[PDB]
RNA sequence: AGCUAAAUAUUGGCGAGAGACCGAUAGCGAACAAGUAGAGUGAUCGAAAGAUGAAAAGAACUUUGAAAAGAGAGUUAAAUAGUACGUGAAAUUGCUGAAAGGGAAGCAUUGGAAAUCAGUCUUACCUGGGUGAGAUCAGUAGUGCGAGACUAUGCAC
RNA sequence: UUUCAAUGGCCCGUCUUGAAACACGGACCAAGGAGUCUAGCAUCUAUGCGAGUGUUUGGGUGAUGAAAACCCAUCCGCGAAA
RNA sequence: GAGAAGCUCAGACGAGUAGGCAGGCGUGGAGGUUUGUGACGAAGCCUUGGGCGUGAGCCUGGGUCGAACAGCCUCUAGUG
RNA sequence: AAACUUUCAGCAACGGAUCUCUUGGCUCUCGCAUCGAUGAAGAACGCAGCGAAAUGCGAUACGUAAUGUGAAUUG
């Protein structure tokens, strides 16, 4: 149960904030859990998703599909992963968007900002 | 509550308990207690005698604190 | 539950419901100042009256002498363990087929008749 | 028209009274606001007493002259008798009432 | 899509339809009623005769104020007309149904029009101007037409 | 609808205390707890008092 | 203060084990574990009466006798109820055991017939099904 | 067709209390059996008064009980008094005698004064235990017309009843129609 | 002649937390590019209009047609979801099937004709009784004092 | 359920002494659609207390999480005298 | 025993506008309760099938449908 | 006997009711005090790679400087 007077339990307000959040907020919103090995290594439960990230799908029809995040569609809260597509009528390939919470990261895209974020969150590198 | 009101029982009855002849028109005998000396006299004189008229002498700026005197037996 | 006799089997349709589609067949008491139905003129439709009431001993009983008790689950069916010869289970329409199978099996085990089995 | 039992009606609602209706839905909020304000005042003036010392006076009517209540401030004669200057009384928290006199 | 009825073999029938066709619904209904139940070739011959005024389409339901001709005695009525626009829409649909039957490989010698139906499409609205500054509706009555042909 | 509708209802303090006392006495009756729907079949004692 | 009549007055029209249906003129059922007759009556209600008897279906076979203990344990629901289980023997033996433990002891003489009937119904429900396929 | 007059057909009495008090229901249940299985009219009177409303069951004071039970030609020394209602305390009675009173309910002051004076207080079920047929019991009821509504009831010309006024004093129904100096008197 | 905080008001503005309120003819006029479209010279007046699908995967290709489109196909859990898209009533309309009809129809009572629906009882308990196996029951009797009740154990086999 | 046969059956609502009326409204259907709330008064009923009765003008537990529940003092309203 | 608000026996009676009273049916929301119903299909809708009640209405079979809904004791109203 | 008309049912139409949702409205409560000649509110005209509306902006024109986050915008 929430107690803070600055915390709103209104469903209307919560939905408005979620569906109207800007790109910076949506980046934090689109977060994926780390694998078990990554959890031991970095002492971090989950991180926001990013491009060039190796993930495997846990839910949905494309379960057990390993791939690297090719793009992050924050406008639609979707992740476009490599080789995760479906055939259109004419034979072209249309990528299938996957929610961030439905995938688990198996290999981070390490950089200065990513390492600084991990250390800031209190995790081993 | 509303569900125990007479209005619920009057649903389906056209006149709503106010009659077909006399109906429930707006004020048909005036507003308030007007007419107590002309057409409400039969009610005023029977149930509120002494309503019209002046009796006694006025007292300007009456203050009840000097007159305060409750009694005990 | 023996020799069940119904005084009237017609459903007391509302006046002029057969003529106007905006007028439903659900009974409404006519309250017109010139209502021939209310005045009960010869040849007009009959109005529901307390005299049409059926015998208290045979009231609410189905032609088989039972009363259709609505049941929604196996726990509801178990309520008729002792009243097997007076109540018959009627499975609720919103009950899924998977739960309806269990309801039918329990009713068969308890001997309770099912009005809408299968 | 009047045809029922009881006293004659006396309702004073011949004006636009509906635009000047005062509700009290903010009563618990006002109570909390006043409590918070006096708690803040107590904290900011600590360790000084929250309420200043007040004199004991007799109400001015026969209806209440047998009781004792709290006055506004101590008279100059009372302050002089007690040995407190009128200028120092305010500094040390003693209210001064120049209008009241000791008869 | 869903058709009104099909109580026959689905492998020996062909279908055609046309939606929101700007032709008179009443005239299309009369043409459909007349051409229902006849063979495809005789239907084409009859439609050509209606084109050339050799034969007429009887008006049985929407016949209010319809003129009388001697060509209605074939169908036993007095009121008959020659709806050219409706006949052409039906001719095109019958040709499409024939093409579908040819694609299906059906025997195009016993093809009989088993089903034909006309429904009222949503009305297109225009305005006409009346006396004393009045504006009044000038709606059209388009038709949905479906045709099923099958072996006899 | 107007805001000045009588939303709040006043009850005498004695009546409120009567209702609270009745509720406490009812809570002390094991049969009433079962009737209200509390699963107290295996409870050791009613009223149930635990250590400080 | 608190009596069986008072408890019945409180729970007669509002309690967990009462199933009320407006059909057939307002019928009622009682689902109390210590109520054998199944009717919503104070005499047959196990929540009030100090001496109460109930019959339940034993798993996987048999019946269970529910007997309220001494009234001194009314404030101790853990010890208030007594469970008895019959062996997988003849129905005649089960009825005789129930009659001995209910009627011949003077516990509830008016409930022996309904207890035997409920035990018979439970056993007749538990008997194997002659599936006519 | 039958020509029968129906005037006193539906009885205008109460067959059960209008209240939902469970304890009053238990008292009614006990006295229904008592009145039905006994020939004493005391039990029937108690049962009838148990149905009565609050306005039909006025309170009675201990001073009134003492005054009624201490009459010279009364011979009421140590017998029980029965009232179906509330027993109130009269503080004007400085010394309370020893009284045995049975009532539906007692006020705290009245019960304390009765107990202090060596008397006893019993409920209706206790009274039924002591005197099942109401033998040697002084049955009383409070003054029914002491209510404020009865000083207004029957108001009219020359009825000398209290009018419904919003205040008191002059300028409130003490003018024409109430004195000879202003047209007519009442 | 003059100044002065606090307790007080606040259908405007800004920020925040809620609701026994309304659920698209409701709730603000405006849930939608609403004081917008549009009307009047002008002051002013002032709407209507929410929902495919989880994801466009928004129907490749063949064929008929001038085309719009149709028929095959294809996607989908669903096209009884195809953008004229959640479900999809009534008024009204077409086809099919049944019935009736001599200047109204509709209704009520009774019955015929045609169509249609349920009544599975001889489940279950029990008397007699052919074949059949089987740790064998009451009466006994031993195991918190009299006595009624019962679980377990040896005889009774 | 449909239809047939015999008998009976005037179009509903409304004003009205009187409506089938040559009196008025009603072409059809869907959705909406009219005794509500408040300041009082009167009767009756229920509840609590009772010569008393009324905690919420206000103050406290208060900070937690508190428009709630709970507690608290002096006045005051009505009644106890006309 | 017979939801004592229960059970049981007997007698008489039954028109109704305006109007009065009582007991009930139905709708939206709230508290309590029902190891309550439900994607193995809730609500809604259609129905040339069935059942109950004098009636307001309710339950159910068969289709369509896709995400919530109901019984009982009370509270409440922009409730027919 | 057809056609026609009427009634019902099954499919297909017209229409958008019912059901379920809702970044909306309404109401209540709490907190705050900040427009302008150093040019306000409002109006007009323009600004994007493809832009009429809304939002934002002003020839430095869906904007520049500075700070924060850290791989996107998306048709």
JSON list of C-alpha atoms (C1' of nucleotides) in Angstrom, two decimals, chain I:
[
{"chain": "I", "resi": 1, "resn": "A", "atom": "C1'", "xyz": [-4.71, 63.00, 10.52]},
{"chain": "I", "resi": 2, "resn": "G", "atom": "C1'", "xyz": [-2.01, 58.00, 9.48]},
{"chain": "I", "resi": 3, "resn": "C", "atom": "C1'", "xyz": [0.29, 52.61, 9.45]},
{"chain": "I", "resi": 4, "resn": "U", "atom": "C1'", "xyz": [-0.10, 47.56, 10.97]},
{"chain": "I", "resi": 5, "resn": "A", "atom": "C1'", "xyz": [0.71, 40.59, 10.40]},
{"chain": "I", "resi": 6, "resn": "A", "atom": "C1'", "xyz": [-2.64, 36.34, 12.18]},
{"chain": "I", "resi": 7, "resn": "A", "atom": "C1'", "xyz": [-7.07, 33.86, 12.51]},
{"chain": "I", "resi": 8, "resn": "U", "atom": "C1'", "xyz": [-11.33, 35.07, 7.26]},
{"chain": "I", "resi": 9, "resn": "A", "atom": "C1'", "xyz": [-12.91, 34.74, 1.51]},
{"chain": "I", "resi": 10, "resn": "U", "atom": "C1'", "xyz": [-11.43, 32.62, -3.15]},
{"chain": "I", "resi": 11, "resn": "U", "atom": "C1'", "xyz": [-16.93, 29.03, -9.74]},
{"chain": "I", "resi": 12, "resn": "G", "atom": "C1'", "xyz": [-9.81, 33.33, -11.95]},
{"chain": "I", "resi": 13, "resn": "G", "atom": "C1'", "xyz": [-4.52, 31.34, -12.75]},
{"chain": "I", "resi": 14, "resn": "C", "atom": "C1'", "xyz": [-0.62, 27.46, -11.51]},
{"chain": "I", "resi": 15, "resn": "G", "atom": "C1'", "xyz": [0.59, 22.61, -9.10]},
{"chain": "I", "resi": 16, "resn": "A", "atom": "C1'", "xyz": [-1.10, 18.22, -6.54]},
{"chain": "I", "resi": 17, "resn": "G", "atom": "C1'", "xyz": [-4.29, 14.21, -4.15]},
{"chain": "I", "resi": 18, "resn": "A", "atom": "C1'", "xyz": [-9.00, 12.04, -4.36]},
{"chain": "I", "resi": 19, "resn": "G", "atom": "C1'", "xyz": [-14.52, 10.52, -5.46]},
{"chain": "I", "resi": 20, "resn": "A", "atom": "C1'", "xyz": [-20.80, 5.35, -3.01]},
{"chain": "I", "resi": 21, "resn": "C", "atom": "C1'", "xyz": [-20.26, 11.20, -9.67]},
{"chain": "I", "resi": 22, "resn": "C", "atom": "C1'", "xyz": [-21.04, 10.42, -15.89]},
{"chain": "I", "resi": 23, "resn": "G", "atom": "C1'", "xyz": [-19.30, 5.84, -19.27]},
{"chain": "I", "resi": 24, "resn": "A", "atom": "C1'", "xyz": [-19.86, 9.06, -25.87]},
{"chain": "I", "resi": 25, "resn": "U", "atom": "C1'", "xyz": [-27.97, 11.59, -27.15]},
{"chain": "I", "resi": 26, "resn": "A", "atom": "C1'", "xyz": [-24.32, 10.88, -20.44]},
{"chain": "I", "resi": 27, "resn": "G", "atom": "C1'", "xyz": [-20.15, 13.99, -18.40]},
{"chain": "I", "resi": 28, "resn": "C", "atom": "C1'", "xyz": [-17.85, 20.89, -19.77]},
{"chain": "I", "resi": 29, "resn": "G", "atom": "C1'", "xyz": [-20.27, 23.17, -25.98]},
{"chain": "I", "resi": 30, "resn": "A", "atom": "C1'", "xyz": [-15.72, 20.43, -26.99]},
{"chain": "I", "resi": 31, "resn": "A", "atom": "C1'", "xyz": [-12.77, 12.30, -24.56]},
{"chain": "I", "resi": 32, "resn": "C", "atom": "C1'", "xyz": [-11.78, 13.19, -31.70]},
{"chain": "I", "resi": 33, "resn": "A", "atom": "C1'", "xyz": [-6.56, 19.19, -35.05]},
{"chain": "I", "resi": 34, "resn": "A", "atom": "C1'", "xyz": [-13.59, 22.59, -30.54]},
{"chain": "I", "resi": 35, "resn": "G", "atom": "C1'", "xyz": [-14.89, 27.81, -29.36]},
{"chain": "I", "resi": 36, "resn": "U", "atom": "C1'", "xyz": [-13.06, 24.00, -34.66]},
{"chain": "I", "resi": 37, "resn": "A", "atom": "C1'", "xyz": [-16.29, 23.52, -39.12]},
{"chain": "I", "resi": 38, "resn": "G", "atom": "C1'", "xyz": [-20.33, 26.43, -40.31]},
{"chain": "I", "resi": 39, "resn": "A", "atom": "C1'", "xyz": [-24.31, 31.06, -39.97]},
{"chain": "I", "resi": 40, "resn": "G", "atom": "C1'", "xyz": [-25.21, 36.34, -39.54]},
{"chain": "I", "resi": 41, "resn": "U", "atom": "C1'", "xyz": [-23.30, 43.19, -41.98]},
{"chain": "I", "resi": 42, "resn": "G", "atom": "C1'", "xyz": [-22.78, 43.13, -36.92]},
{"chain": "I", "resi": 43, "resn": "A", "atom": "C1'", "xyz": [-23.32, 42.42, -31.67]},
{"chain": "I", "resi": 44, "resn": "U", "atom": "C1'", "xyz": [-23.32, 37.31, -31.44]},
{"chain": "I", "resi": 45, "resn": "C", "atom": "C1'", "xyz": [-24.88, 32.04, -32.55]},
{"chain": "I", "resi": 46, "resn": "G", "atom": "C1'", "xyz": [-22.24, 27.46, -32.66]},
{"chain": "I", "resi": 47, "resn": "A", "atom": "C1'", "xyz": [-22.25, 21.76, -33.83]},
{"chain": "I", "resi": 48, "resn": "A", "atom": "C1'", "xyz": [-21.56, 16.62, -35.49]},
{"chain": "I", "resi": 49, "resn": "A", "atom": "C1'", "xyz": [-17.84, 13.16, -34.90]},
{"chain": "I", "resi": 50, "resn": "G", "atom": "C1'", "xyz": [-14.47, 7.50, -29.68]},
{"chain": "I", "resi": 51, "resn": "A", "atom": "C1'", "xyz": [-13.32, 1.54, -30.40]},
{"chain": "I", "resi": 52, "resn": "U", "atom": "C1'", "xyz": [-10.28, -3.47, -36.97]},
{"chain": "I", "resi": 53, "resn": "G", "atom": "C1'", "xyz": [-6.78, -6.59, -35.13]},
{"chain": "I", "resi": 54, "resn": "A", "atom": "C1'", "xyz": [-1.97, -8.95, -30.09]},
{"chain": "I", "resi": 55, "resn": "A", "atom": "C1'", "xyz": [0.72, -7.63, -34.28]},
{"chain": "I", "resi": 56, "resn": "A", "atom": "C1'", "xyz": [-1.05, -4.60, -40.96]},
{"chain": "I", "resi": 57, "resn": "A", "atom": "C1'", "xyz": [0.20, -9.75, -40.84]},
{"chain": "I", "resi": 58, "resn": "G", "atom": "C1'", "xyz": [-4.08, -3.98, -44.55]},
{"chain": "I", "resi": 59, "resn": "A", "atom": "C1'", "xyz": [-5.16, -9.64, -48.90]},
{"chain": "I", "resi": 60, "resn": "A", "atom": "C1'", "xyz": [1.14, -11.76, -52.97]},
{"chain": "I", "resi": 61, "resn": "C", "atom": "C1'", "xyz": [-0.31, -14.17, -57.39]},
{"chain": "I", "resi": 62, "resn": "U", "atom": "C1'", "xyz": [-4.00, -16.20, -61.41]},
{"chain": "I", "resi": 63, "resn": "U", "atom": "C1'", "xyz": [-8.41, -15.16, -64.02]},
{"chain": "I", "resi": 64, "resn": "U", "atom": "C1'", "xyz": [-13.03, -12.02, -65.83]},
{"chain": "I", "resi": 65, "resn": "G", "atom": "C1'", "xyz": [-13.97, -6.84, -66.57]},
{"chain": "I", "resi": 66, "resn": "A", "atom": "C1'", "xyz": [-12.50, -0.45, -69.98]},
{"chain": "I", "resi": 67, "resn": "A", "atom": "C1'", "xyz": [-12.71, 0.50, -64.96]},
{"chain": "I", "resi": 68, "resn": "A", "atom": "C1'", "xyz": [-14.90, 0.33, -60.29]},
{"chain": "I", "resi": 69, "resn": "A", "atom": "C1'", "xyz": [-14.87, -4.33, -58.82]},
{"chain": "I", "resi": 70, "resn": "G", "atom": "C1'", "xyz": [-15.90, -9.88, -58.83]},
{"chain": "I", "resi": 71, "resn": "A", "atom": "C1'", "xyz": [-14.23, -15.18, -58.47]},
{"chain": "I", "resi": 72, "resn": "G", "atom": "C1'", "xyz": [-10.28, -18.13, -57.05]},
{"chain": "I", "resi": 73, "resn": "A", "atom": "C1'", "xyz": [-6.43, -17.78, -53.65]},
{"chain": "I", "resi": 74, "resn": "G", "atom": "C1'", "xyz": [-3.54, -15.75, -49.12]},
{"chain": "I", "resi": 75, "resn": "U", "atom": "C1'", "xyz": [-2.91, -13.44, -43.58]},
{"chain": "I", "resi": 76, "resn": "U", "atom": "C1'", "xyz": [-5.16, -14.22, -38.83]},
{"chain": "I", "resi": 77, "resn": "A", "atom": "C1'", "xyz": [-7.56, -17.55, -33.19]},
{"chain": "I", "resi": 78, "resn": "A", "atom": "C1'", "xyz": [-11.42, -15.13, -35.91]},
{"chain": "I", "resi": 79, "resn": "A", "atom": "C1'", "xyz": [-12.48, -11.76, -42.55]},
{"chain": "I", "resi": 80, "resn": "U", "atom": "C1'", "xyz": [-19.76, -14.22, -38.71]},
{"chain": "I", "resi": 81, "resn": "A", "atom": "C1'", "xyz": [-12.74, -8.53, -37.69]},
{"chain": "I", "resi": 82, "resn": "G", "atom": "C1'", "xyz": [-11.26, -6.11, -44.82]},
{"chain": "I", "resi": 83, "resn": "U", "atom": "C1'", "xyz": [-10.10, 0.02, -42.92]},
{"chain": "I", "resi": 84, "resn": "A", "atom": "C1'", "xyz": [-18.12, 1.38, -45.62]},
{"chain": "I", "resi": 85, "resn": "C", "atom": "C1'", "xyz": [-13.53, -2.51, -39.86]},
{"chain": "I", "resi": 86, "resn": "G", "atom": "C1'", "xyz": [-15.15, -4.36, -31.37]},
{"chain": "I", "resi": 87, "resn": "U", "atom": "C1'", "xyz": [-20.34, -6.81, -30.62]},
{"chain": "I", "resi": 88, "resn": "G", "atom": "C1'", "xyz": [-24.19, -5.47, -33.94]},
{"chain": "I", "resi": 89, "resn": "A", "atom": "C1'", "xyz": [-31.14, -4.66, -31.64]},
{"chain": "I", "resi": 90, "resn": "A", "atom": "C1'", "xyz": [-35.48, -2.32, -33.62]},
{"chain": "I", "resi": 91, "resn": "A", "atom": "C1'", "xyz": [-37.94, 0.51, -37.42]},
{"chain": "I", "resi": 92, "resn": "U", "atom": "C1'", "xyz": [-37.33, -0.65, -42.89]},
{"chain": "I", "resi": 93, "resn": "U", "atom": "C1'", "xyz": [-35.77, -4.03, -47.16]},
{"chain": "I", "resi": 94, "resn": "G", "atom": "C1'", "xyz": [-34.35, -8.47, -50.62]},
{"chain": "I", "resi": 95, "resn": "C", "atom": "C1'", "xyz": [-34.14, -13.89, -51.43]},
{"chain": "I", "resi": 96, "resn": "U", "atom": "C1'", "xyz": [-35.71, -18.66, -49.67]},
{"chain": "I", "resi": 97, "resn": "G", "atom": "C1'", "xyz": [-39.32, -21.84, -46.86]},
{"chain": "I", "resi": 98, "resn": "A", "atom": "C1'", "xyz": [-44.27, -22.46, -44.55]},
{"chain": "I", "resi": 99, "resn": "A", "atom": "C1'", "xyz": [-49.43, -20.70, -44.19]},
{"chain": "I", "resi": 100, "resn": "A", "atom": "C1'", "xyz": [-53.65, -17.61, -45.16]},
{"chain": "I", "resi": 101, "resn": "G", "atom": "C1'", "xyz": [-56.46, -14.10, -48.08]},
{"chain": "I", "resi": 102, "resn": "G", "atom": "C1'", "xyz": [-64.57, -12.70, -51.85]},
{"chain": "I", "resi": 103, "resn": "G", "atom": "C1'", "xyz": [-64.71, -4.35, -49.59]},
{"chain": "I", "resi": 104, "resn": "A", "atom": "C1'", "xyz": [-59.51, -4.33, -43.66]},
{"chain": "I", "resi": 105, "resn": "A", "atom": "C1'", "xyz": [-56.26, -6.65, -40.33]},
{"chain": "I", "resi": 106, "resn": "G", "atom": "C1'", "xyz": [-55.07, -7.52, -35.50]},
{"chain": "I", "resi": 107, "resn": "C", "atom": "C1'", "xyz": [-57.51, -10.30, -30.50]},
{"chain": "I", "resi": 108, "resn": "A", "atom": "C1'", "xyz": [-60.26, -13.75, -26.86]},
{"chain": "I", "resi": 109, "resn": "U", "atom": "C1'", "xyz": [-62.79, -18.92, -25.80]},
{"chain": "I", "resi": 110, "resn": "U", "atom": "C1'", "xyz": [-63.23, -24.00, -27.59]},
{"chain": "I", "resi": 111, "resn": "G", "atom": "C1'", "xyz": [-61.64, -27.83, -30.68]},
{"chain": "I", "resi": 112, "resn": "G", "atom": "C1'", "xyz": [-59.82, -30.08, -35.48]},
{"chain": "I", "resi": 113, "resn": "A", "atom": "C1'", "xyz": [-55.60, -30.44, -38.97]},
{"chain": "I", "resi": 114, "resn": "A", "atom": "C1'", "xyz": [-50.28, -29.98, -39.71]},
{"chain": "I", "resi": 115, "resn": "A", "atom": "C1'", "xyz": [-45.54, -29.25, -37.31]},
{"chain": "I", "resi": 116, "resn": "U", "atom": "C1'", "xyz": [-42.90, -29.61, -32.85]},
{"chain": "I", "resi": 117, "resn": "C", "atom": "C1'", "xyz": [-41.37, -30.75, -27.31]},
{"chain": "I", "resi": 118, "resn": "A", "atom": "C1'", "xyz": [-40.85, -33.54, -22.68]},
{"chain": "I", "resi": 119, "resn": "G", "atom": "C1'", "xyz": [-42.25, -37.45, -19.89]},
{"chain": "I", "resi": 120, "resn": "U", "atom": "C1'", "xyz": [-36.42, -43.26, -19.69]},
{"chain": "I", "resi": 121, "resn": "C", "atom": "C1'", "xyz": [-40.28, -45.31, -14.64]},
{"chain": "I", "resi": 122, "resn": "U", "atom": "C1'", "xyz": [-38.54, -51.81, -14.80]},
{"chain": "I", "resi": 123, "resn": "U", "atom": "C1'", "xyz": [-32.84, -45.82, -11.22]},
{"chain": "I", "resi": 124, "resn": "A", "atom": "C1'", "xyz": [-32.12, -47.02, -5.85]},
{"chain": "I", "resi": 125, "resn": "C", "atom": "C1'", "xyz": [-33.55, -49.74, -1.07]},
{"chain": "I", "resi": 126, "resn": "C", "atom": "C1'", "xyz": [-35.77, -54.69, -0.16]},
{"chain": "I", "resi": 127, "resn": "U", "atom": "C1'", "xyz": [-38.80, -60.49, -0.23]},
{"chain": "I", "resi": 128, "resn": "G", "atom": "C1'", "xyz": [-37.89, -65.19, -2.58]},
{"chain": "I", "resi": 129, "resn": "G", "atom": "C1'", "xyz": [-34.18, -67.44, -5.22]},
{"chain": "I", "resi": 130, "resn": "G", "atom": "C1'", "xyz": [-30.03, -70.86, -9.34]},
{"chain": "I", "resi": 131, "resn": "U", "atom": "C1'", "xyz": [-23.76, -70.44, -9.70]},
{"chain": "I", "resi": 132, "resn": "G", "atom": "C1'", "xyz": [-19.83, -68.42, -7.15]},
{"chain": "I", "resi": 133, "resn": "A", "atom": "C1'", "xyz": [-15.54, -67.01, -3.78]},
{"chain": "I", "resi": 134, "resn": "G", "atom": "C1'", "xyz": [-14.60, -64.86, 0.73]},
{"chain": "I", "resi": 135, "resn": "A", "atom": "C1'", "xyz": [-9.47, -61.36, 6.44]},
{"chain": "I", "resi": 136, "resn": "U", "atom": "C1'", "xyz": [-16.90, -64.21, 8.98]},
{"chain": "I", "resi": 137, "resn": "C", "atom": "C1'", "xyz": [-21.67, -61.94, 12.14]},
{"chain": "I", "resi": 138, "resn": "A", "atom": "C1'", "xyz": [-24.86, -61.27, 16.33]},
{"chain": "I", "resi": 139, "resn": "G", "atom": "C1'", "xyz": [-25.07, -63.82, 20.69]},
{"chain": "I", "resi": 140, "resn": "U", "atom": "C1'", "xyz": [-20.67, -64.59, 24.08]},
{"chain": "I", "resi": 141, "resn": "A", "atom": "C1'", "xyz": [-16.38, -63.08, 26.12]},
{"chain": "I", "resi": 142, "resn": "G", "atom": "C1'", "xyz": [-11.46, -60.24, 27.64]},
{"chain": "I", "resi": 143, "resn": "U", "atom": "C1'", "xyz": [-9.78, -55.36, 27.37]},
{"chain": "I", "resi": 144, "resn": "G", "atom": "C1'", "xyz": [-11.90, -45.22, 34.15]},
{"chain": "I", "resi": 145, "resn": "C", "atom": "C1'", "xyz": [-16.09, -48.26, 39.56]},
{"chain": "I", "resi": 146, "resn": "G", "atom": "C1'", "xyz": [-22.53, -49.26, 38.68]},
{"chain": "I", "resi": 147, "resn": "A", "atom": "C1'", "xyz": [-25.05, -48.88, 33.87]},
{"chain": "I", "resi": 148, "resn": "G", "atom": "C1'", "xyz": [-26.62, -47.48, 27.80]},
{"chain": "I", "resi": 149, "resn": "A", "atom": "C1'", "xyz": [-23.25, -46.53, 23.64]},
{"chain": "I", "resi": 150, "resn": "C", "atom": "C1'", "xyz": [-18.95, -47.61, 20.49]},
{"chain": "I", "resi": 151, "resn": "U", "atom": "C1'", "xyz": [-12.85, -48.29, 18.13]},
{"chain": "I", "resi": 152, "resn": "A", "atom": "C1'", "xyz": [-9.41, -52.17, 18.56]},
{"chain": "I", "resi": 153, "resn": "U", "atom": "C1'", "xyz": [-8.19, -57.63, 20.03]},
{"chain": "I", "resi": 154, "resn": "G", "atom": "C1'", "xyz": [-8.70, -63.85, 21.08]},
{"chain": "I", "resi": 155, "resn": "C", "atom": "C1'", "xyz": [-13.17, -67.59, 21.12]},
{"chain": "I", "resi": 156, "resn": "A", "atom": "C1'", "xyz": [-17.41, -68.45, 18.42]},
{"chain": "I", "resi": 157, "resn": "C", "atom": "C1'", "xyz": [-14.67, -70.84, 12.15]}
]
